[PDB]
């Protein structure tokens, strides 16, 4: 945990200005930081405020340095340096340590080295957990699923059967990976279940938020690429494919057989329909209503934002009657054209 | 479980064309299928492609049969036949087998024949589980709740107290049935909890997806009809009634005391207001904003879909100022007339 | 079971009829039978009170002439209903006593009359106040503190360093304290920002099922006293919610949003972050909140449902509204 400021600077590739023997115990916001804390400045408007910050050290740029009133770590990119130093000084505990006597683990499960399984977690037959995997308390990992080295599940995560998860993933509590996709045939109004015998394949370095659901495929697989980040409360339907490094913010709903490219950014509460493709490098702003394929990179948006309710009532009434407005406009144009 | 093609054809009521002794081990998509697999063709444009499919048998229609390049099962409805053969050849495991020594089962719980309960599940007093019920690992089933024969819960499902679930239901993980409805009275700005002492009644053959919540009623009950299918991440508020055979796709949010008729279809991410009714045979397309009662069957839609952001900025600004556009149109009409 | 006269006294209601009637429970007007008390708020029900079979009806003074049973007269029947339903509550507790299958770290501190349900897992450093009840299968992470009288239903997840006040209630499937969605970006690769802030939940907070409230990045996510939050809500890192605000089901809130006191956020609304909503704001259902709200009142958005045939035309015309605007401008110029 605690680290000499000089050592922290070397690991951050930062230029130290000040006492390298200062001991840093943790990261804090500029407002909250006290002795022993390191903090960071990304906004030069706070230069005049640094004498009010009581951090032992502040990460800043070269242009900021003349304004320091503390030991300073000078870097090109304070925000990225903050992320790195917060990892070095991370106080987040592990989901579990060692193997809980109350865990229920099938004799055929294969564990790598340094695996931890929390209290009352349930591990099915054929499961493989790679080196350094951590399964939180209360999880379920279904038959024959494989979790790659370094991956970690927080408490009360559910992995169904035949799921593959790569290395260095992180899954937050309440998430369900591998439930049945929403597949039914129809025999005269009677829904006939289509067994969902595809899988979910999750790549390396994937982070998934809490209470997110990712359904298994109907025959072929649901696929989440490497480096993807998914927020809370998302729904990823059967046979969705998400390309490497795409980010999906909270509450996004994706319908079946959607394909999303690489380096996409899907804003919170968006709705993305299925059986279509979104190309690489597309940004959908929050609450976007995606009805058609997207074939060019760029930023796309939908939605009519808030108005005072009395105003909204009129806006909505006029929009709902916009066909009459169109007809009146055309009628007027004809009269002005002398026809 | 492997099966002879002629035996499979018989169970499917299909006309066999080819070798009945072929052993089928599984179902596969047309592109993935290998020897031992059965697959199906629903799209006649793939007739010319059948010689590229390595399945041991293909389900198809009588019109497709001249194009077969394999043993064929001829049926009227290949898609329905696929559903049925996938059931016959299902590889999905059961949520549990036998009764786990780590399950915690109240002495007063009543278990039927051939009930399986997974590791660390918790069964309260007065619970009744019918024959062949399977409770996944980590589940909670609350006091006096009843689960009908053949119904199955995947892992980590929560059923509260006094819940009734019918026969042959299936509930996916993370789902919560019977939490308090959102009932509060207001006392000078402070919320006063209204205990929710109604229940949830779930019919037979209901399928519920993952991380869905169905709240119990305030006084009378939340009711899910028979044959209803509900996708993931849905919110079904207190005292909602959903008619038989209705389908609710993922992410739908329903407010309290909504009544939906039979054979409705509610598209994903729709939002439905409360204290009102939707009649039978209504379809709401995805993201529908349902504010008012629906009294006639048919298809209903809302929402302005995506545009390039530069375009959207103008669309949104113009719509928000549409009253001014309307006034100008009226003024121009008066001036011209 | 309670004598009507006693129930009326506890509700500060004026009794009209036989005080010795024994009330066993609350029921809706349509379902009520002998032994039940019910209530009416809508005067449409006056004509058919002869058909209500309750033993007593909570009503107003103006309703009293239509009464066909013992009546409790009050100013506010709905609020009185809430109070009498609490007196007559049949809801069981999430747990009774400490289950032998619960796994409780030796360093956890438990107050008086704490109950812990089967297979719950209590981490090191946890503090549970007097009369706290933890449901079956819950997880409560390291050093979290839950204040007296608070209750978790089954399968609730509380992460580490979380603080929950007194008399709270959290429904099943809810997750409090997961990582906020915080990442830096290094040449297209996401770089996790550890989320080492917390969640602070006040007193008398109720949280619905499968709701998620993320911990803050450095400073905290804060839920005020008396806040009620429905199912399937997302409260992002460093959101702050003022006292007595209500959040209906399926609301998604983005990071660093500040919501004032006495707000009402309608179901399925979407509230963007790094902005503030003042006190006494109502956002009706499905509201798309993109800008700060600085004046109290009611706000709304969205183009509602139409028959599909009509919607197709509405949507096409709105998407082309810039062309309509240009055509109107051109016509004004010509005229
Ligand atoms: C991943 C990141 C580090 C960067 C990022 O772009 C991002 C983040 N949080 C975000 N929350 N909501 C959000 C909006 C409304 C409600 C709830 C959440 C976004 O829409 C986010 C977005 C974002 C914004 C627009 C388009 C696409 C994205 Cl993904 C954090
Ligand atoms: C049940 C079925 C076999 C048939 C079906 O109609 C269906 C299905 N999946 C569906 N996903 N989304 C969906 C759309 C957007 C986001 C998430 C999911 C529908 O809206 C579906 C619908 C559907 C479409 C329109 C109206 C009502 C419904 Cl129920 C699969
Ligand atoms: C808290 C309360 C006792 C009172 C209340 O105002 C309320 C309640 N439940 C509500 N469900 N949905 C809801 C709407 C659509 C889908 C799902 C749920 C509201 O939008 C509610 C609202 C409400 C209505 C208008 C504006 C803001 C709010 Cl909060 C119950
Ligand atoms: Mg146990
Ligand atoms: Mg939603």
Cβ neighbours around B327 below 10 Å, total: 10
Query: Measuring from atom 9 of ligand 3, which residue has the nearest CA?
Result: C248
Token readout for B19 is 């070798």
Give dist(CA C213, CA C240) in Å, integer. Answer: 11
Query: For residue A185, which atom of ligand 2 is closest to its CA?
Result: 3
Whether residue C158 contacts residue C177, with contact meaning beta carbons closer than 8 Å, is answered with yes
Write out chain A residues lying below 8 Å of C210, CB-based.
Answer: 174, 211
Whether residue C143 contacts residue C126, with contact meaning beta carbons closer than 8 Å, is answered with yes
C128-131 CB contacts, 8 Å cutoff, 24+ apart:
C129/C166
Q: Domains along chain C?
A: 1-97 (3.40.1390.10), 98-335 (2.160.10.10)
Closest CA to B240 of B214, B270, B210: B214
Whether residue A303 contacts residue A287, with contact meaning beta carbons closer than 8 Å, is answered with yes
Closest CA to A266 of A230, A302, A223: A230
Write out chain C residues lying below 8 Å of B294, CB-based.
Answer: 305
Substitution target from B135, B231, B301 for chain A, most A beta carbons within 10 A: B231
Token readout for C137 is 């299968």
Whether residue C233 contacts residue C216, with contact meaning beta carbons closer than 8 Å, is answered with no
Ligand nearest to the CA of B235: 3
> Distance of CA A95 to CAs A137, A293, B212, B309, C13, Å?
7, 40, 25, 42, 53
> Distance of CA A152 to CAs A139, A205, A207, C215, Å?
11, 11, 10, 18
If DSSP codes are grouped into helix, strand and coil, which group holds residue B62? coil
Give dist(CA B81, CA B38) in Å, integer. Answer: 11
Query: Which of B120, B191, B271 minimises the CB distance to C119?
Result: B120
* CA dihedral (B94, A218, B246, C173) positive or negative: positive
Resolution (A): 1.7
With tokens 């005292």, the residue in question is B239
CA A102 to centroid of chain Cα atoms: 31
Chains that touch B (3 or more CB pairs under 8 A): A, C
Token readout for C6 is 């006693």
Give dist(CA C21, CA A289) in Å, integer. Answer: 58
Query: Measuring from atom 8 of ligand 1, which residue has the nearest CA?
Result: A249
Give dist(CA B117, CA B120) in Å, integer. Answer: 9
Query: Which of C190, C293, C299 minimises the CB distance to A245?
Result: C190
Give dist(CA B158, CA B181) in Å, integer. Answer: 15
With tokens 């002794």, the residue in question is B21
**Bridge partners for B307 per DSSP:** A301
DSSP B69-97: SSEEEE-S-HHHHHHHHHHHT--PPPS--
Beta strands at C246-247 and C264-265: parallel, antiparallel or unpaired: parallel
Sequence-distant (6+) residues with CB within 8 A of B236 are: B212, B213, B214, B215, B222, B224, B230, B242, B248, B254
DSSP A291-309: -S-B-S-EEEE-----EEH
Sequence-distant (6+) residues with CB within 8 A of B280 are: B243, B261, B262, B263, B264, B297
Pocket of ligand 3 (CB under 6 A): B 182, 184, 253, 255, 271, 273; C 246, 248-250, 264-268, 282, 284-285
According to DSSP, residue C217 is labeled S
Give dist(CA B164, CA B148) in Å, integer. Answer: 8
Experimental approach taken: X-ray
Closest CA to A251 of B259, C212, B274: C212
Phi, psi of A320 (to 5 degrees): -65, -25
Beta strands at A307-308 and C297-300: parallel, antiparallel or unpaired: antiparallel
R_g of chain A computed on alpha carbons? 26
CA B232 to centroid of chain Cα atoms: 7
Sequence-distant (6+) residues with CB within 8 A of B263 are: A189, B243, B244, B245, B246, B280, B281
Substitution target from B135, B210, B332 for chain A, most A beta carbons within 10 A: B210
DSSP C230-298: -TT-EE-TT-EE-TT-EE-TT-EE-TT-EE-TT-EE-TT-EE-SS-EE-SSEEE-TT-EE-S-B-S-EE
Describe the crossing of helices B309-320 and B322-336 by its angle, rounded to 10 degrees: 60
Query: Which of B220, B253, B302 minimises the CB distance to C304?
Result: B302
Give dist(CA C168, CA C200) in Å, integer. Answer: 12
Write out chain A residues lying below 8 Å of B172, CB-based.
Answer: 176, 179-180
Whether residue A231 contacts residue C181, with contact meaning beta carbons closer than 8 Å, is answered with yes
- Measured over all CA atoms, what is the biggest interatomic distance in chain B, rounded to whole angstroms? 87
Whether residue B90 contacts residue B24, with contact meaning beta carbons closer than 8 Å, is answered with no
- Probe residue for ligand 1, chosen from A268, A287, A301 as the CB with the greatest number of ligand atoms within 8 Å: A268
Give dist(CA C144, CA B271) in Å, integer. Answer: 36
**Bridge partners for B146 per DSSP:** B128, B164
Cβ neighbours around C97 below 10 Å, total: 11
| Nearest chain A alpha carbon to B270 | A271
Residues of A that are catalytic = 238
According to DSSP, residue B179 is labeled P
Whether residue B58 contacts residue B41, with contact meaning beta carbons closer than 8 Å, is answered with yes
Interchain contact, B232 vs A190, CB within 8 Å: no
A82-85 CB contacts, 8 Å cutoff, 24+ apart:
A82/A27, A82/A40, A82/A42, A82/C184, A82/C193, A83/C183, A83/C184, A83/C191, A83/C192, A83/C193, A84/A11, A84/A12, A84/C191, A85/A8, A85/A12, A85/A27, A85/A38, A85/A40, A85/A59
Q: Is C48 an active-site residue?
A: no
According to DSSP, residue A61 is labeled -
Substitution target from B230, B235, B314, B321 for chain C, most C beta carbons within 10 A: B235
According to DSSP, residue B294 is labeled B
Write out chain B residues lying below 8 Å of A285, CB-based.
Answer: 309
**Strand (E) or helix (H) holding B158:** strand B158-159
Sequence-distant (6+) residues with CB within 8 A of B334 are: none
With tokens 């708020």, the residue in question is C41
Give dist(CA C15, CA C10) in Å, integer. Answer: 11
Give dist(CA B252, CA B234) in Å, integer. Answer: 5
**Bridge partners for C38 per DSSP:** C57
């Amino acid at each position: 945990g605690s680290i000499r400021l000089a050592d922290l600077a070397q690991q951050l590739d930062a230029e130290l200005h000040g006492d390298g023997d200062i001991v840093i115990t943790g990261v804090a916001s500029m407002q909250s930081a006290q002795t022993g804390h390191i903090t960071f400045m990304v906004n030069p408007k706070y230069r005049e405020h640094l004498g009010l910050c009581q951090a032992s050290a502040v990460v800043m740029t070269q242009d900021d340095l003349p304004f320091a009133k503390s030991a300073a770590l000078v870097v090109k990119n304070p925000y990225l340096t903050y992320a790195r130093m917060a990892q070095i000084l991370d106080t987040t505990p592990q989901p579990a340590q060692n193997i809980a006597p109350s865990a229920v683990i099938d004799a055929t499960a294969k564990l790598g080295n340094n695996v931890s399984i929390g209290a009352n977690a349930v591990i099915e037959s054929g499961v493989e957990l790679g080196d350094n995997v951590i399964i939180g308390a209360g999880c379920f990992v279904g038959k024959n699923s494989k979790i790659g080295a370094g991956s970690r599940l927080w408490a009360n995560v559910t992995i169904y059967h035949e799921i593959q998860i790569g290395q260095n993933c992180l899954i937050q509590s309440g998430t369900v990976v591998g439930a049945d996709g929403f597949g039914y045939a129809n025999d005269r109004g009677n829904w006939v279940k289509i067994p969902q015998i595809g899988r979910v394949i999750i790549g390396d370095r994937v982070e998934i938020g809490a209470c997110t659901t990712i359904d298994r495929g109907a025959l072929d697989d649901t696929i989440i690429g490497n480096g993807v980040i998914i927020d809370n409360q998302c729904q990823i339907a059967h046979n969705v494919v998400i390309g490497d490094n795409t980010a999906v913010a909270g509450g996004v709903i994706m319908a079946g057989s959607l394909k999303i490219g690489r380096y996409c950014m899907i804003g919170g509460a968006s709705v993305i329909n299925g059986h279509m493709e979104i190309c690489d490098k597309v940004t959908v702003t929050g609450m976007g209503m995606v009805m058609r394929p997207i074939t060019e990179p760029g930023v796309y948006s939908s939605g009519i934002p808030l108005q005072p309710n009395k105003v909204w009532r009129k806006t909505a009434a006029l929009v709902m009657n916009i066909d009459d407005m169109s007809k009146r406009l055309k009628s007027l144009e004809r009269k002005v054209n002398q026809q």
